[PDB]
Amino acid sequence: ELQMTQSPASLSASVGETVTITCRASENIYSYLAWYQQKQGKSPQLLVYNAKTLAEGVPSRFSGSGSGTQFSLKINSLQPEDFGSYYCQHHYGTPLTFGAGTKLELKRADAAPTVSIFPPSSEQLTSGGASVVCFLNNFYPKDINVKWKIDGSERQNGVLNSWTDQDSKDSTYSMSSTLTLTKDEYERHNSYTCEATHKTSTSPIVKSFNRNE
Amino acid sequence: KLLESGPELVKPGASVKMSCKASGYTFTSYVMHWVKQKPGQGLEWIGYINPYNDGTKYNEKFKGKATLTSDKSSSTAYMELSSLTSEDSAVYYCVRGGYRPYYAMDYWGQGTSVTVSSAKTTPPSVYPLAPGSNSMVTLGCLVKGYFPEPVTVTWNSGSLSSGVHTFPAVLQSDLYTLSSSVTVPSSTWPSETVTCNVAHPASSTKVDKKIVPRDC
Numbered sequence: 001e002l003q004m005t006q007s008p009a010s011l012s013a014s015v016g017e018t019v020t021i022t023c024r025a026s027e028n029i030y031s032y033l034a035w036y037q038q039k040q041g042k043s044p045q046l047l048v049y050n051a052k053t054l055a056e057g058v059p060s061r062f063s064g065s066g067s068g069t070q071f072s073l074k075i076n077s078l079q080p081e082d083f084g085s086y087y088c089q090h091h092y093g094t095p096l097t098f099g100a101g102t103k104l105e106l107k108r109a110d111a112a113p114t115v116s117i118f119p120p121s122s123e124q125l126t127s128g129g130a131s132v133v134c135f136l137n138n139f140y141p142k143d144i145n146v147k148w149k150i151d152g153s154e155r156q157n158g159v160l161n162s163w164t165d166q167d168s169k170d171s172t173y174s175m176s177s178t179l180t181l182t183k184d185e186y187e188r189h190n191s192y193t194c195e196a197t198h199k200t201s202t203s204p205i206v207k208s209f210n211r212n213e
Numbered sequence: 214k215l216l217e218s219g220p221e222l223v224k225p226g227a228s229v230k231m232s233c234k235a236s237g238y239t240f241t242s243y244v245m246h247w248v249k250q251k252p253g254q255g256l257e258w259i260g261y262i263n264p265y266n267d268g269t270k271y272n273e274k275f276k277g278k279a280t281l282t283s284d285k286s287s288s289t290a291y292m293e294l295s296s297l298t299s300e301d302s303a304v305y306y307c308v309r310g311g312y313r314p315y316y317a318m319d320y321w322g323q324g325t326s327v328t329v330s331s332a333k334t335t336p337p338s339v340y341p342l343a344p345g346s347n348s349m350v351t352l353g354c355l356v357k358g359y360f361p362e363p364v365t366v367t368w369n370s371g372s373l374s375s376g377v378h379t380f381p382a383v384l385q386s387d388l389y390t391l392s393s394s395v396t397v398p399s400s401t402w403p404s405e406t407v408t409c410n411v412a413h414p415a416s417s418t419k420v421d422k423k424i425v426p427r428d429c
Contacts, residue, residue: 034317036256043306043321044256050315087256091317094270096246101255116351116394118342122428124355133342133355135394137378160390162380176380176392178355209345213429 002026006088006099012107012141015078021102023071023088032092035064035073038085040165048073049091105142108171112200113139117193117207120186130186134194134207137174142166145197146177147204150189155179186211215307215322222328222361228295231325233307235288241265244310245290246318247281251303253381261310262290294327302329302384332360332387336416339409341424342394350402352424353394354409359416366393367410373397 003026013019023033031051036044046055048064051071061076075082083106088099113136120130136144142163148155158180166173177194193208218232233245247259260271262281269281278301283290294301304324311317335358342353356364366379376396382389397407408423 032316038256043323045321046317046319049311049317049319053315055319089256089258089318091311095272096258096261096318098256098258114349114351114396116344116353118353119345119427121340121342121355124338124340124357127338131340131355131357133353133392135351135353135378135392137351137394137396160383160385162383162392164378164380174378174380174394176378176394178390178392213346 002029002090002095002097004088004090004097004099006102009100009102010142011102011104013078013104014107015080017078018074018076019078019104021073021086021088021104023066023073023099025069025071025090028068029090029092031067032090033064033066033071034089034091036087036089038087039081040084044087105166106171108140110200111138111140111172113137113144113175113196113198113205115194115196115205115207117209119192119209119211125183128183130181130183132179132181132186132192132194134177134179135174136177136196138167138170138172139174139198139200140172141199142173143199144173144175146175147195147197148177148179149191149193149195149208151191215309215320217305217307217322217325220326220328222330223297224331225297225299225329227297228293229297229327230291230293231305231327233290233292233322235290235309238309240283240288240290241285243312245281245283246308246310247279247292248306248308248318248321249275249303250306250324259292259305264290297327297329299329301327303327328361328384330360330384330387334415335360335388336418337364337389337411337413337420339411339420339422341409341422342392343424343427345427348399349396350399351394351396352402352407353392354411354422354424356391356393356411358388358390359413360388361415362389363414364389364391365412366391368393368395369406369408370410373407 005024035048038044063074118133195204197204216234246261249257264283280293308318337359340355379393382391
């Protein structure tokens with residue numbers, strides 16, 4: 001039954017700032033709690049075992065506290081390398097359950113999405129397929145919603161989404177959304193739109209095109 | 214150090230055995246855990262084997278799906294996964310467990326990627342994304358229907374690197390689909406050329422698609 005609740009799932013912070021991640025165990029696990037750090041691309045690495053003990057070779061700014069049911073990892077004075085994903089894990093006996101994980105992300109200023117919409121290329125059309133692509137680029141924060149419409153009604157399925165990790169240079173996010181249809185479905189309807197609901201506007205941004213253009 | 218085997222492409226209903234060479238220590242001294250991570254998602258404990266006695270404990274959710282063994286002679290632990298489905302597509306790690314002192318998993322391996330698909334090696338279709346109906350214009354390429362990963366995308370043979378976003382591939386109905394956009398000044402394209410370069414090493418394929426304005 002052992003459940004490990006790690007919050008927040010998403011944390012914004014600057015370099016030098018002092019952040020705190022928490023882990024709640026559903027039952028008493030004493031000091032049997034470890035913290036790992038997983039950089040983008042790599043295997044995880046042990047930071048802390050026994051709730052408060054730093055593994056050899058781990059910098060001292062990292063600092064685990066807590067016991068029984070309530071646990072925290074603190075990182076004093078952040079550094080560029082300290083950004084990533086962070087997991088708790090129970091390690092007494094079975095199951096050695098992980099918390100859901102926290103993505104430590106570099107804050108910046110809010111930015112609206114740049115939305116571009118793209119009809120199916122003529123090349124795809126000769127294959128017998130049709131994909132409409134919408135890019136939503138360089139927005140912050142990472143939370144966003146996209147809705148597709150064909151004529152005057154939503155389309156749920158056929159939509160594949162993909163997201164970039166946070167940018168090296170400008171610390172933003174971007175998102176691709178592709179709606180796929182048969183050529184006959186695509187040709188049977190005129191208008192195609194892509195609505196972007198972001199915190200940077202009460203109103204959603206709408207980009208569209210008429211097939212007959 | 215712990216070294217795992219390479220990436221794997223397996224059909225639905227088949228099985229895979231992945232290996233994990235333990236070294237730098239006495240294997241029969243320490244347990245060996247296995248951990249599952251779907252791409253872009255959390256970690257999940259599978260179980261452990263104790264090489265000394267071959268003793269197993271499993272996350273109940275993986276009992277029957279995962280089978281741990283260990284050949285003490287070759288210092289190597291295995292995990293066999295059986296009757297594979299889409300859900301089993303993940304990266305899998307072996308991880309050494311701690312000692313009497315205070316338990317706890319310490320040394321991870323590099324991981325082993327497992328992909329479940331019925332597809333054979335397939336080259337990508339590359340479709341240009343030109344604007345239909347401003348100081349900056351966004352263009353792009355849709356790279357569709359390939360297998361396996363990875364493909365690489367550049368623009369103008371690398372010399373266009375600012376304003377480029379190449380998105381992670383998504384696997385639907387056995388094949389991958391990826392996209393890439395590039396934003397340039399409306400004063401340049403289409404008077405200056407913009408071309409995407411898409412390489413797919415597994416099929417020995419390279420494709421240049423010049424982006425041309427839509428006809429009308």
